[PDB]
Design a protein around this motif. Structure first.
Motif, PDB file in Angstrom:
ATOM      1  N   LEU A 229       6.155  -3.592   2.368  1.00 38.90           N
ATOM      2  CA  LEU A 229       5.273  -2.947   1.394  1.00 38.90           C
ATOM      3  C   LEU A 229       3.783  -3.121   1.706  1.00 38.90           C
TER       4      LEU A 229
ATOM      5  N   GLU B 198      10.473  -7.744   1.908  1.00 38.31           N
ATOM      6  CA  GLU B 198      10.144  -6.472   1.296  1.00 38.31           C
ATOM      7  C   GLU B 198       8.666  -6.389   0.891  1.00 38.31           C
ATOM      8  N   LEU B 199       8.073  -7.518   0.516  1.00 36.57           N
ATOM      9  CA  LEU B 199       6.664  -7.530   0.128  1.00 36.57           C
ATOM     10  C   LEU B 199       5.781  -7.428   1.350  1.00 36.57           C
TER      11      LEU B 199
ATOM     12  N   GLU C 119       8.392   4.760  -1.247  1.00 33.60           N
ATOM     13  CA  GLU C 119       7.288   4.646  -0.308  1.00 33.60           C
ATOM     14  C   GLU C 119       7.630   5.214   1.075  1.00 33.60           C
TER      15      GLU C 119
ATOM     16  N   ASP D 283       8.833   2.050  -9.642  1.00 31.22           N
ATOM     17  CA  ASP D 283       7.721   1.108  -9.596  1.00 31.22           C
ATOM     18  C   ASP D 283       8.178  -0.254  -9.049  1.00 31.22           C
ATOM     19  N   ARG D 284       7.221  -1.036  -8.569  1.00 31.34           N
ATOM     20  CA  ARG D 284       7.534  -2.334  -7.993  1.00 31.34           C
ATOM     21  C   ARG D 284       7.981  -3.351  -9.037  1.00 31.34           C
TER      22      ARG D 284
ATOM     23  N   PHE E 279       0.062  -5.783 -10.075  1.00 28.18           N
ATOM     24  CA  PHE E 279       1.030  -6.017  -9.023  1.00 28.18           C
ATOM     25  C   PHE E 279       0.910  -7.431  -8.508  1.00 28.18           C
TER      26      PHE E 279
ATOM     27  N   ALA F 134      11.373   0.894  -4.791  1.00 29.09           N
ATOM     28  CA  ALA F 134       9.939   1.060  -4.554  1.00 29.09           C
ATOM     29  C   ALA F 134       9.717   1.272  -3.093  1.00 29.09           C
TER      30      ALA F 134
ATOM     31  N   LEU G 164      12.393  -4.454  -5.804  1.00 24.10           N
ATOM     32  CA  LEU G 164      11.608  -3.699  -4.827  1.00 24.10           C
ATOM     33  C   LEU G 164      12.418  -2.690  -4.009  1.00 24.10           C
TER      34      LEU G 164
END
Ligand SMILES: Nc1ncnc2c1ncn2[C@@H]1O[C@H](COP(=O)(O)OP(=O)(O)O)[C@@H](O)[C@H]1O
Lengths: 209, 233
Positions: B71, B67-68, B205, B185-186, B14, B201, B198
């Motif tokens: 996350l 988004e990261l 989540e 998945d990311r 990742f 993902a 994302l």
């Protein structure tokens, strides 16, 4: 992960970029007097962000720099952030001397970025962010003052702890922890004074020669 | 063993993908800017076009770091949730309304109709309205983006003794059965600017964080159907 850190630190340079590009697109490209200079900045910032990502996917790099107009450059990028598009003034009061100091340029520019973000973000309802560069006692002092929400005197310590945020919008609370981390990593010291509702003042001391 | 190890390995790939997926628009950026600095800016026939491409790429990376960041906040558990009893029916309806009205303001590249088939019961359910409406948004966005022209996004709100089900059906080209596992998945994209890998993902989540479960059924060449299951009473 440590991914959270790059996530955080790309924020302010992404902003600098989007802001400048929007300025050029909004007509500045037609202006020969400024468009190149802006392009040099967007270039420099992009390259910065690339360096940032590379070092953090895989150390300090100490070099002697002229602190005066490095601070002026950072402040310039923020002057352009605050333009385009409450009103904020960056009031600059530097010594006229050119103080040179041993630092990591990219790391330290990240520090100033976080502290101008703080001075601005927790200053809604307008403000004048006041930036001073001076020296005493073989130390080089930078101060940044804002007319923000201030800090409860209870928390004046915890503001440099990881994830620690005051009560009252936004962020993970890693700005000032990263800042302190970097400043101590460069042989310097960082601290804050603040009056709740009045505003705040952030200080960084770096050894001079 | 493979316990701790699947964890650490997933984590390191990742990180490798974040490195690349971040770096690549920066690279594209560098190329256009460098082009403009080397004269292209004096050229009215190309300089605007370049500036728009650079604008867009910059916006792209901004969304990506947002988004990261959400996350990171969700893995950490930092992500606070606020479960509250709300009307799923009119929440889902309001979402669909926003989408109907974007395309009701024109001229549109491609045309889609949103077909709503809801249960007539008024399902009240404890959820965080803002995170879950973000979920519905990504999945609708998705449903729309991979749709043909004249496509029909078929949205269903239904119920079973044990569950409350939302389905979002598209008539796109579907998903290879190899990849059905991997679509959440990311950074996983089927082919593909337009957005970060994302979307889904984050969606999975958030949904698991709200105690529900999310999955996809799909037939290559026919299309897809995304399902969200929420506990009901
Ligand atoms: N001028 C300022 N005025 C009041 N509080 C500040 C100021 N600068 C920093 N802080 C405080 O430091 C806390 C967290 O700082 P920070 O690490 O920068 O968070 P963030 O993730 O939002 O960037 C904040 O809650 C804030 O109250």
């Amino acid at each position: 992960q440590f991914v959270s850190n790059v996530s955080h630190e790309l924020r302010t340079p992404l902003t600098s970029l989007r802001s400048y590009i929007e300025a050029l697109s909004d007509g500045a490209w037609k202006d020969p007097e400024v468009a190149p200079g802006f392009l040099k900045v967007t270039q420099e910032e992009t390259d910065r962000m690339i360096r940032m990502i590379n070092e953090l996917l895989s150390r300090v790099d100490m070099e002697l720099v002229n602190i005066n107009e490095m601070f002026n450059y950072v402040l310039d990028r923020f002057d352009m952030i605050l333009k385009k598009d409450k009103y904020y003034t960056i009031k600059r009061e530097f010594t006229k001397r050119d103080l040179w100091v041993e630092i990591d340029t990219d790391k330290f520019t990240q520090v100033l970025d976080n502290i101008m973000n703080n001075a601005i973000k927790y200053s809604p309802d307008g403000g004048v962010v006041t930036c001073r560069l001076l020296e005493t006692h073989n130390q080089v002092i930078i101060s940044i003052s804002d007319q923000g929400l201030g800090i409860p005197r209870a928390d004046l310590g915890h503001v440099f702890d990881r994830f620690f945020r005051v009560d009252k919008q936004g962020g993970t609370g890693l700005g000032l922890a990263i800042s302190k981390e970097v400043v101590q990593m460069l042989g310097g010291r960082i601290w804050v004074d603040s009056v709740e509702g009045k505003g705040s003042t952030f200080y960084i001391s770096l050894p001079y020669e």
